[PDB]
């Protein structure tokens, strides 16, 4: 659990980006100014929701350690949504927005992932929420977010493909 | 250092992704197989260059540690290009592919970063190569990639921005 003196400076930099007056805390106003500069236009209310999720001491503002938490939570969530999406892309050959049992079977076999056709058929059956025989994005996401589970092995194979697809391409 | 059995399990899965036949080394042929499936269509000299760029023992294939090196490199580059791209998208308010002195001043002020008329001025002069008085994507990247150390501070605030913009949406 070390800590590079640089990595610290970076969190300091992210923090100062929000704390304009530099008193050590992040007020809603401050969060908003930044938020707008990036895109969204959250309401005095929507902003408060962000604070609460990290407000450890519940004093209304965001201190460095709390921001640190928020920072991480989002770094993880953002990184995740990206590799899952990237993976979806790698599977949805035709790009029509679905993943036919063919697309799935082929990719997994072409990567030397070694998965019995049954396991692949099972994978689909389980992810197929609406039962249309294919996997849409929502259903793919769910599958990568959810006992006698060897489905965990499959998820790790897929997370790697996603991560790889990003890192490279 | 701070290494967990989770990271280890991740790199193994990644390496295994490339080592189709599980022999402990990744060949130019396997690199290609994964790369094509990942969407790209690299060429023979392009694969070779990838391997020689990390082939410490120079045996023509890639073993685990060399792969780790490759991974760290690609990961660092990818994260950099994304943060920088996002930062540019944040400054280019009108989204015309250029960043005028106005925009640069707007965003830096809004956030909480210094930059007086002179600072924003030299910054643009330094980065502007074609001399059209502005800063396009190319120049921006080159500038973010590099006399006082003042420049270094501005570059760092810009990275935090790229980083934050990405992490928030
Ligand atoms: Ca403050
Ligand atoms: Ca607090
Ligand atoms: Ca499809
Ligand atoms: Ca379905
Ligand atoms: Ca091999
Ligand atoms: Ca080697
Ligand atoms: Ca512009
Ligand atoms: Ca220019």
UniProtKB/Swiss-Prot annotation, chains A, B:
It comes from the Eukaryota. Its main location: cytoplasm. There is a cross-link at residue 20 (Glycyl lysine isopeptide (Lys-Gly) (interchain with G-Cter in SUMO2)). Pfam families: EF-hand_7 (PF13499). Gene3D superfamilies: EF-hand. One of its GO terms (cellular component) is cytoplasm. One of its GO terms (biological process) is regulation of release of sequestered calcium ion into cytosol by sarcoplasmic reticulum. Keywords: Acetylation, Calcium, Cytoplasm, Cytoskeleton, Isopeptide bond, Metal-binding, Methylation, Phosphoprotein, Repeat, Ubl conjugation. The N-terminal and C-terminal lobes of CALM bind to the C-terminus of KCNQ1 in a clamp-like conformation. Binding of CALM C-terminus to KCNQ1 is calcium-independent but is essential for assembly of the structure. Binding of CALM N-terminus to KCNQ1 is calcium-dependent and regulates electrophysiological activity of the channel. The C-lobe interacts with KCNN4 channels in a calcium-independent manner, whereas the N-lobe interacts with the S4-S5 linker of KCNN4 in a calcium-dependent manner playing a role as calcium sensor and gating the channel. Calmodulin acts as part of a calcium signal transduction pathway by mediating the control of a large number of enzymes, ion channels, aquaporins and other proteins through calcium-binding. Calcium-binding is required for the activation of calmodulin. Among the enzymes to be stimulated by the calmodulin-calcium complex are a number of protein kinases, such as myosin light-chain kinases and calmodulin-dependent protein kinase type II (CaMK2), and phosphatases. This is Calmodulin. It comes from Bos taurus (Bovine).
């Amino acid at each position: 659990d070390q800590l590079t003196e640089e990595q610290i400076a970076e969190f300091k930099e992210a923090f100062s980006l929000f704390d304009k007056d530099g008193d050590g805390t992040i007020t809603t106003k401050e969060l908003g100014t930044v938020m707008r500069s990036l895109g969204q236009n959250p309401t005095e209310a929507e902003l408060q929701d962000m604070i609460n999720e990290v407000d450890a001491d519940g004093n209304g503002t965001i201190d460095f350690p709390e921001f640190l938490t928020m920072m991480a939570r989002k770094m993880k969530d953002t990184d995740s949504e990206e590799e899952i999406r990237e993976a979806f892309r790698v599977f949805d050959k035709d790009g029509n927005g679905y993943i036919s049992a063919a697309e799935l079977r082929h990719v997994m076999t072409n990567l030397g992932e070694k998965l019995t056709d049954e396991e692949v058929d099972e994978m689909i059956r389980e992810a197929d929420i609406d039962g249309d025989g294919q996997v849409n994005y929502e259903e793919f996401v769910q599958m990568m977010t959810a006992a006698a589970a060897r489905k965990e092995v499959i998820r790790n194979k897929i997370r790697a493909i996603g991560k790889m697809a990003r890192v490279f391409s």
